[PDB]
Design a protein around this ligand. Structure first.
Ligand SMILES: O=C(O)Cc1c(C(=O)O)[nH]c2c(Cl)ccc(Cl)c12
Ligand SMILES: O=C(O)Cc1c(C(=O)O)[nH]c2c(Cl)ccc(Cl)c12
Ligand SMILES: O=C(O)Cc1c(C(=O)O)[nH]c2c(Cl)ccc(Cl)c12
Ligand SMILES: O=C(O)Cc1c(C(=O)O)[nH]c2c(Cl)ccc(Cl)c12
Lengths: 343, 343
């Protein structure tokens, strides 16, 4: 297990990441209390997830860079850039939890819900974002792929924020409007809000650190990764309700949160005037009774089988995509990810 | 009036800035509704201020770059980078208004207070930030000072966010604690939260676009600009209460908002046990009666004269700083700014 094993080396590097970020506090004792708050923000929000995005950078790096060019320093940079992706993720989650008024994250109370934090979490989120560029400058300033990485992280933030904008417009809190839950909107939200930074960013970062800055190579990798990103979110949506909490480790809340889920989009394409009514009067509700009604309608429309068939077609398509666009990159780079997400 | 005149050319460029930013909507009709929201965010938040930060970039550019190297394209880039500073300012203001629960900005209702916006303004703020880098890439990608500007804008955001962190820790909303309102804390907040991006960033940007990337030249300019930034905020604090609304165009709210103002810091250094009590039981209050009490105490401690004497000493110091660190830059670059802020 490239992940399960390399995971230990990644997480252990975090302590060094924090140290380096809270080091400028030296020659500037004036901002000491600010640096202390930053450390607290980092420890609370960058730790606790699965680190799949960051680990992907490392895994892809090792497979893309010849073993003789994998010096202690090159690997040092790999872990750092990987942690940068985790900081981007933390920047997003802290801000997103505020915007949808979530109560918990990773099973723990949302950072902004903490007593004494509140809306100050908005500035905390921005600090997480800024740490990304601080780390890149500190570890890759002299590297030839420095500018490429800066532009990639900036582009990934923009794409994601654009996707968040689409999502906010699509599912306005306190206003259930199933009318805008179209398949085209859903695919656009997934592509911009999730796919780009979760699947393309990590590999693309590793590609640049390996010297693979070709626009065509990046365009081909993106073609594959965005499709995998699309499947990931669709499977994530499906599991949110039909998944086993004992295996998933979480309880679904998409229905209650009136999210533009793949399930609701598919349910809206197969629903009849009467079914639609039930969905319109039960979606976005917290009462278990109303949620159960939604889930009942989904099963009736046999959405679970629809997804089963979708996963099989998606997998075949991804293999074909890999078979066609992987080269000159080692197929393993993509196959490794596919094996992980296709459960 | 370099400003009053050049101001027209700057503001008129905004329409082009918006056009270029909402142009990617072409090959991506999918994010059309998102791009429409972005345009609305830009128009509402980037317009309405005084544009002094952005105009400084242009003014400094013209004085630093020989007239024969000021082609239509170079000037185009100048206006753009100047507008980037205004986007940074808009990113900050939108977020700061949310964090301190302000009602209005530039006399109009705060963006987040608008019906249908609310906490979504958090993502809108991030989009404003992202547009900065989109413009730099679109206009300065091929320029030799491209990376310098990216790093400067990133560094300026970090400094500012750090200053915001210090400020939040110093004046926690709903918790008046005059104890932490020290002169050293105040100076640190001003330096990081205001001085760097308001005075150093604009000139430093112009310096890079002129080829002046010397670390020593930048270090000397910073020495001057941070001191001017410090005076600016101190005078801004003083005018917030003792200024004439007919001339300032705004009503003071620092006392009501429990801000770490220069006035309160000075009042805490000259106040007696009994005076301190009055301040402790009237600062951060909205009732006009309580505010009037604070203002009364300030006058008694003759703070207005203290400021008058401070402005004169500050001006002499700045001239000496210019006299010493301006070269090889034209003193006019700094004198122009000094004439504007020293009223
Ligand atoms: O970590 C996650 O939240 C989802 C996730 C899983 C996974 O669940 O196995 N795996 C991932 C990989 Cl390999 C790349 C990127 C992402 Cl986002 C993931
Ligand atoms: O989504 C929500 O409104 C609140 C909420 C959160 C949460 O915010 O973490 N988690 C929930 C779970 Cl696990 C079950 C049912 C509900 Cl209502 C919630
Ligand atoms: O525009 C402002 O809010 C304050 C301000 C004034 C001014 O008030 O004259 N002038 C400025 C200059 Cl020249 C450079 C940077 C800044 Cl912030 C300012
Ligand atoms: O600062 C505040 O609490 C609200 C507030 C704002 C404002 O938020 O724009 N403006 C004010 C003025 Cl002009 C006078 C007195 C108060 Cl109380 C305020």
């Amino acid at each position: 297990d490239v992940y399960a094993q390399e995971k230990q080396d990644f997480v252990q590097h975090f302590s060094q990441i924090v140290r380096v970020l809270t080091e400028d506090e030296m020659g500037h004792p004036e901002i000491g209390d600010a640096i202390a708050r930053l450390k607290e923000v980092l420890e609370y929000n960058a730790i606790g997830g699965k680190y799949n995005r960051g680990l992907t950078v490392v895994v892809a790096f090792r497979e893309l860079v010849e073993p003789r060019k994998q010096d202690a320093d090159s690997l040092q940079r790999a872990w750092t850039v990987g942690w940068c992706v985790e900081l981007l993720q933390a920047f997003f989650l802290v801000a997103d939890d505020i915007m949808d008024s979530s109560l918990t994250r990773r099973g723990q109370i949302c950072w902004y819900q903490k007593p004494g934090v509140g809306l100050d979490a908005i500035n905390d989120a921005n600090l997480l974002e800024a740490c990304i560029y601080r780390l890149l400058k500190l570890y890759c300033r002299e590297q030839p792929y420095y500018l490429n990485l800066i532009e990639l992280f900036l582009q990934s933030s923009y794409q994601t924020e654009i996707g968040q904008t689409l999502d906010l417009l699509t599912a306005p809190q306190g206003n259930v409007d199933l009318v805008r839950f179209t398949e085209k909107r859903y695919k656009s939200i997934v592509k911009y809000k999730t796919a780009f930074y979760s699947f393309y960013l990590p590999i693309a970062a590793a590609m640049y650190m390996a010297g693979i800055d070709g626009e065509k190579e990046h365009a081909n990798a993106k073609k594959i990764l965005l499709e995998m990103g699309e499947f990931f979110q669709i499977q994530d949506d499906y599991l949110d309700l039909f998944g086993d909490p004992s295996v998933t480790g979480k309880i679904g809340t998409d229905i209650q949160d009136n999210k533009c889920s793949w399930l609701v989009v598919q349910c809206l394409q197969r629903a009849t005037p009467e079914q639609y009514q039930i969905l319109k009067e039960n979606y976005g509700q917290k009462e278990a009774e109303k949620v159960a009604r939604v889930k009942a309608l989904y099963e009736e429309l046999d959405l679970p089988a629809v997804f089963l068939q979708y996963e099989e077609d998606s997998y075949s398509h991804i293999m074909a995509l890999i078979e066609q666009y992987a080269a000159p990159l080692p197929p393993a780079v993509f196959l490794g990810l596919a094996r992980k997400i296709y459960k």
